[PDB]
Amino acid sequence: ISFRQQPEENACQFQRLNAQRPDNRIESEGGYIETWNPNNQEFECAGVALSRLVLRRNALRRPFYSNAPQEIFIQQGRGYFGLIFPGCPSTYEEPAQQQQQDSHQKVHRFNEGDLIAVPTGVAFWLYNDHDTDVVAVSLTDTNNNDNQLDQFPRRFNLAGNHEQEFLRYQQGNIFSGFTPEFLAQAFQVDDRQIVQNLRGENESEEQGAIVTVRGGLRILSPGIEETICTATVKKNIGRNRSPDIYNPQAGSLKTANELNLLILRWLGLSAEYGNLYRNALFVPHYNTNAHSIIYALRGRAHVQVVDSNGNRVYDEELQEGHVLVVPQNFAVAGKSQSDNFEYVAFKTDSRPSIANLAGENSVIDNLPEEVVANSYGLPREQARQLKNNNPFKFFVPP
Amino acid sequence: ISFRQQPEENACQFQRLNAQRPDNRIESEGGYIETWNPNNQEFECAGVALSRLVLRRNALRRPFYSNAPQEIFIQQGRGYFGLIFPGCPSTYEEPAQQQQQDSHQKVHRFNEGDLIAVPTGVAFWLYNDHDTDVVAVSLTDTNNNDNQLDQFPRRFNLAGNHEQEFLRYQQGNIFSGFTPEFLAQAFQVDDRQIVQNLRGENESEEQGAIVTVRGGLRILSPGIEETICTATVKKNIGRNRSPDIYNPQAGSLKTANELNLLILRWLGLSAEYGNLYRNALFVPHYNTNAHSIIYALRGRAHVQVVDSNGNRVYDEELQEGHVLVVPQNFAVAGKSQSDNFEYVAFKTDSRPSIANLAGENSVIDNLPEEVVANSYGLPREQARQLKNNNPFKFFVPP
Amino acid sequence: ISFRQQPEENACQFQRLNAQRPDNRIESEGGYIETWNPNNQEFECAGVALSRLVLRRNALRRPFYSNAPQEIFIQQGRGYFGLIFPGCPSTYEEPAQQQQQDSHQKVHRFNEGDLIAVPTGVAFWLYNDHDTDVVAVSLTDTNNNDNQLDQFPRRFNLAGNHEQEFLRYQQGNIFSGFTPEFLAQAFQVDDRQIVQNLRGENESEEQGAIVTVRGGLRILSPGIEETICTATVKKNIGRNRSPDIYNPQAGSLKTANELNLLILRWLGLSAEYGNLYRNALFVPHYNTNAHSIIYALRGRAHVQVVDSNGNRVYDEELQEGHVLVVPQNFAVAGKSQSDNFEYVAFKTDSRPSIANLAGENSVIDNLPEEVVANSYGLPREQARQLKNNNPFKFFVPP
Amino acid sequence: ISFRQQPEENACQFQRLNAQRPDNRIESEGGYIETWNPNNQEFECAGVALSRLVLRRNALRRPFYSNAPQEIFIQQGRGYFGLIFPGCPSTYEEPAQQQQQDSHQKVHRFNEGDLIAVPTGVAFWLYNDHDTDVVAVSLTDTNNNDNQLDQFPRRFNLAGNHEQEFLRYQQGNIFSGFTPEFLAQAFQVDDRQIVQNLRGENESEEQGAIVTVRGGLRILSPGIEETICTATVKKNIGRNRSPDIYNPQAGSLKTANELNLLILRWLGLSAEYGNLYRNALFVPHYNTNAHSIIYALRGRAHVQVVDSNGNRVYDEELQEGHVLVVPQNFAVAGKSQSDNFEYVAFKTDSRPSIANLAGENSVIDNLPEEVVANSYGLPREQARQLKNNNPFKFFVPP
Amino acid sequence: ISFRQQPEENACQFQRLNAQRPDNRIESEGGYIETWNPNNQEFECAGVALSRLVLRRNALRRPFYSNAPQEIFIQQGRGYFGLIFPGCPSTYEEPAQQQQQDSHQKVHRFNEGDLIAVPTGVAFWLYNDHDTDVVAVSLTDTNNNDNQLDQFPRRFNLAGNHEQEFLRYQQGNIFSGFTPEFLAQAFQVDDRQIVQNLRGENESEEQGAIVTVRGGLRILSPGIEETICTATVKKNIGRNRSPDIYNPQAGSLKTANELNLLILRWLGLSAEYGNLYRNALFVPHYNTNAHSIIYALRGRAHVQVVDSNGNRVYDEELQEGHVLVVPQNFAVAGKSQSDNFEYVAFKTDSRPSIANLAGENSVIDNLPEEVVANSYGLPREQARQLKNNNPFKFFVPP
Ligand code: NA
Ligand code: NA
Ligand code: NA
Ligand code: NA
Ligand code: NA
Description:
Entry title: Crystal structure of peanut major allergen ara h 3
PDB class: allergen
Organism of A, B, C, D, E: Arachis hypogaea
Structural class of chain A: mainly beta
Chains A, B, C, D, E: Arachin Arah3 isoform
CATH class of the largest domain in chain A: Mainly Beta
Largest interface: A-B, 70 and 75 residues
Keywords: peanut allergen, allergy, glycinin, allergen
Oligomer: part of a larger assembly
Bound molecules: sodium ion
CATH superfamily of the largest domain in chain A: Jelly Rolls
Shape of chain A: elongated
Strand content of chain A: 35-45%
């Protein structure tokens, strides 16, 4: 399911669909954030915004929450993240060096291939504790029903004194806007310099969203607390040894949707990770109920996309680090021109449905032979060939 | 329930409501499609598009899917249709002249009075195998949540090389946009002329959406396959020997909603079929939770519609083949000027609720006598008359 | 949950947030209705309209229904109201002075502190039978999914011949628009002067929505009828001896949401009533999933609101009878400058979720100590103070 | 809805139905508990157990939880109760005489007429702070799906050293069963006499479930905390100024079901409170989907109950403090022989449905006249009398 | 949630609770199956049966389905399993050495710590491809609503000619019961020796449920197909780097319930994996809504269990490979007497709720101080100690 705002008149009427690369980079201390322009037609149509975060060893992306739900895919690396679900008690705690030292909400490990769901207004932070840079691609669903503000994807930063991620595309931290007397009362701290730091007064716009932790972070990691407050918030789909669709001579597909990661039901979002081997084809298909935002992860594939007029709105080699939006119901097909073309496709429904146009149990396969024969002007025998020559589903070997 | 986009500022503020007739006809080989202009205020307000299809004996409306959910009402005729639900296995099959000849998804018979639900992105085809022309009136819900593209009702045609139904009102087939090398791989057909026909290369813009089948079509007709893949997709309401509301001296009403046809729950749509006998009245009423799109089927009725200012925005004889949109909450009443005025009313909710203003259990009937007396400046006795003189619900005899 | 239309581009981007007072008063016989301009940025952002009704002893607000769901809070007074749920049989009846005198739908008592839910298209009337004026503050959710007309909050009046509440802000009664011959047939009344009064012909635009009942109203008050037709439609939250959050030295909070008043689930709305004692603080917090429309009921409080840029968009004393909209996710904090500051806060979700930024189980409390230390540049000890110095939730004593 | 275990073979086959009075009293310090024998046929059939608690001024019924869901009706008196929902944070707190003194879960006020829902395993305590004795009648649903133990209604007492309520009918406190070394570690109390008292070692079997608090109790009373952790758990139905069905010359009915008190949906239980005035009749009716456990509150009524053989299994004056079980689908009718007969009827469904056999919209009223005429051997005119002579619903005046 | 049959009268009334070890072993070719007697009081009470499977390198547990839902926990080892969901198309396929070689349903990898959900009537097979023996502990929910046969847990074996697992405890394969002429027609195999083998005719009762695959198995592994047919059926909880509750000085807990593994919602089952370090305590607690079936995985713990009479029904060292049933609502506490006591606890609800009796946010912590003081006969100060001395949740360090 999904419940989203429709795009403005004509947004999904295309002369041509363009693949997109980021157009801005925001520098910080231990990494950076790159943004795709959400004002481009492809993104206006899909009603979403996209960004990419790089976190070096010991870098902390300091906590923030957003008005629009997010899905974050971990392209590379491993580390820790927390989500703060409001009012949920702490369940991670340690004895002083019995009295209590520190306690906090569950800290999660993440790995390459993980897809993480961040509900609207839930605070998120991410940390890399390893050499390999973490690279995360974040889809922010601006048109989602859950966003009751206008279609600007905001980051409400809990810390720092820097530029909002997507501010440059529109026509300080959250604490920094409150007066010192409110914050001293709120936190019962008399130390006016505790409140100064809280407000970000002891830093420039160039410390950024991401800080490096000298010596590394130490955090705890090996009724309502073990039920709703500890619901699952991520699922591995990129590294998984169990794809949903698999042909060892053509490729694989694996989805994280609301049947795999229940919280996606509330978000109205899902994602798929696919592999397509050299010269293999993902058959013409369309998504009945979702836009697809395809981020090329590795390699390259010749991709074609067809609109409701049968126009070829996109025809080229989709390369690593570029993004192609395939609007709901537009048909798409791809032939990998790499040993293994790899991609993540975010989708704007929690249970997206693929309709294959060719192959076993495809639309053509499921029409009566005489209907295929009469629709295409074909003798009964050539119609039977169209229905039966390809015995495979989804992927076709070289 | 329904989840739809609201109309633009002022769309439902009317100086006058106009009844509408089609304004375009698209010719094909065995029939035609007529469209109502969806840009007219009445349709902008309702957020929907309407069309009418005529299929002569042996005519096939070749498969297509759409971005917006549809409800199709069979005004006359009988025939076969298929819906292709993606990935559902074939369940209709026959032995070669044991090995398998052809197999395909369930083929359904349709009859006059049938209301058929077509979910977003589900492919549909229709065939008439009888002398009587089939006439189908199709409501396309452009503002529906399920449509994540802009508010243009598209037809993604699987076959042919013709004009999109509603294209003329905006500011080739799906295969025709793919290169021949993609389609040969996708269908494993080496015959480049199989792929030519598939793409519609062997036909003009004037073969159209509808083809005639010489000698007639032959199709099969007497776990997940007998459960979800064979869910009901139509319900008879026009020919039914069991209306929901009935008075043999005034008229009848029968609804297909989500309690009768479960799939309507996902579509957010329903329809009603009514009869009103000469000089009988359907009392002033309004729909709490839906627009009503009234297509006159037979005869004529004097209809009045009142807006939130108590203005009479419509006051005339609604005739057969004209359409009147009654916006949500506007009050409407009708007096049949024909032996039997017959109408289908599509509604933009899966469970629309009628609030009668006069008659048994109406709004007036359910207010305390002293409230009716004090609201209208009436003596207790004249208030009692207003509540009680009409003992009938919905319809009132001549 | 809620399903609402998003506001236009930039609506929730504020240079400053203004508190608002009503800007129009509509006079009637036994009371008046005051409206806030819904075109002001604060209301455009929230997608809602607000009004205030005053009903003197024996005054009847004559029946009406609206396209948008309402929540009405009873600030003062007591009286009777009815809601007319269409087609539900009468369940209140009396013997003639056995035959039946009058019968009607359930009449409800209301009291100060009551929050009443009025679904879209359900007719409502209100009566005051006591000396104390009734004062009701009404939130109309114009952007709600249930409103399938444009974003004008309409009142479809069943009686009278006066001005629609919100008409002055856009770019007769319902019966008055029908011809006398339709109404005589509909109600089977031959008396053409019964129909004249019904249409409001025997009154000026200056009798208004509210009439005085001379001698007072007499009404009855001590399967589907005792189940769905008598579902609960109100909950006391202002006068309640059982707040949800309570600290006798700082304040209280009490909510009516879909867990307390089930019908709110369909409306997508809820409300909260809070008390804050002199010099006590409601800590910086935000609502994850709702706009807050704060109506000051008694006293005054210094309030600050911070946007996604950390800008202080509102900083002043919120006074009784003024309204402050806090957009979804914006942070807000308040310090009462009165013996008891009292407020109702309507919220645009049926289950709104508050995320406290300071105090026990707040966002800061639930982050690892080393994350708070590294986010704010603080030694481990000053981080521990930020997490632990305030042991209270929500409210902090003077 | 409800999900319950069916009774053993023949349990609901009755020679006669007997009204029942309690058969045991358990004495304590400030009040007592009386139990009805759950082994009697009437209770075996209904699959439930019943008890009655009396709490004098300053008496505390010390905390306990049970394996079966309960509904408690407050027949008289007023006081405080708490329910402990596991893991929910405290939301009632006070400053030490800023640091925190005590904090605890919400304390609720209760009043006469309140119906309180206690889910399976949720701990409950009750306190009377007024002169008038509190009298509470408790229905324990032993056959409920939520009880996964055998059909013995247990009380797991958190305190005391006394007899389990229903133990005498089968074929120490919870802490008392743990060894002192477990409890010292669990509560980190070194004081072995703290643990002695906890275990109930400093008291006899004759301090009982109920203790008197000398000087009276002092308690606090004027994200997940204000949402799920503060869901409503009671609804007034006995004292309510708004019955669901009302005739000032015959009686009233008011229900607390899952549309009024949402938590009842999980419990599978509901209750009704009725008044019937001298010589008035509640018409023959049956409950489609629930047993009815009728506790007479005040006065007396001649009651008759008819089984599936048309046998009169009960025919007598039901008196105050007696209980009559009416099995699902058995027909029942009553004529009050008191100025006002008052009763609470617990029902074993969360949304019980009454089917009236006589009167407006009854079963007879809703059958075609010719069906009533042919079913009873009656001329058309006598059939019309049977359908129409009684114009009232539910109750009929003297 | 769960919907289960209640146990017979007195089943959960215990003189003493006994830990249980298996009492039977069924030998096969590459491993064995051990069963616990389901007729023992502990299992009668819980309404469940338990077994343990060992599969050596290259051993295949041949396909079977059961009348009762199962949860299988992988104690050690790694391998492949399939579940056959009826009518779901194949999604794993390979090209002949383009035509199709073999195709089949998704084959899943499993690892140590995995919890696998097997719905009623879904066929399951398991294979070990590694040196380490796989050991799986299987809970079969005999009293589950989904089992509409009597309370005998059956295995309907698709292959083999051996003893049913639990047959010895009651008062050939599925094909073997059909006549050869039915099977030849059903599979269109003329070879009467193909059908002989299918029926298990070419093997003794001593080939067993488990076969060894010489040279090892080769299987494929790297619309409705990628949605419902590929829903998740397992979740790792034993090996997971992210417990729900964690204290590095006492222990951890991690649950797989319906918020983590959605299919458990239909099964009415869940499981927890816990670690408890030497001399640490899991505080007295109870489960509100589930039986707990505790299988000791490693080490030993002193465990005590208390019934509704405060009787200590179990008091001893629970050792590895023994099982202890803790009935719903009975209180339990454990102190590890090993470096790391490890256990899996199956629970008879899809969302079981733990109610802690001591510690932060426990039942005692959430009662008003004066209620704890008056319930236990304690001065205000000793009551405060009981509420506050243990600042930890669930686990308490040595
Ligand atoms: Na298009
Ligand atoms: Na209007
Ligand atoms: Na902002
Ligand atoms: Na009987
Ligand atoms: Na017991």
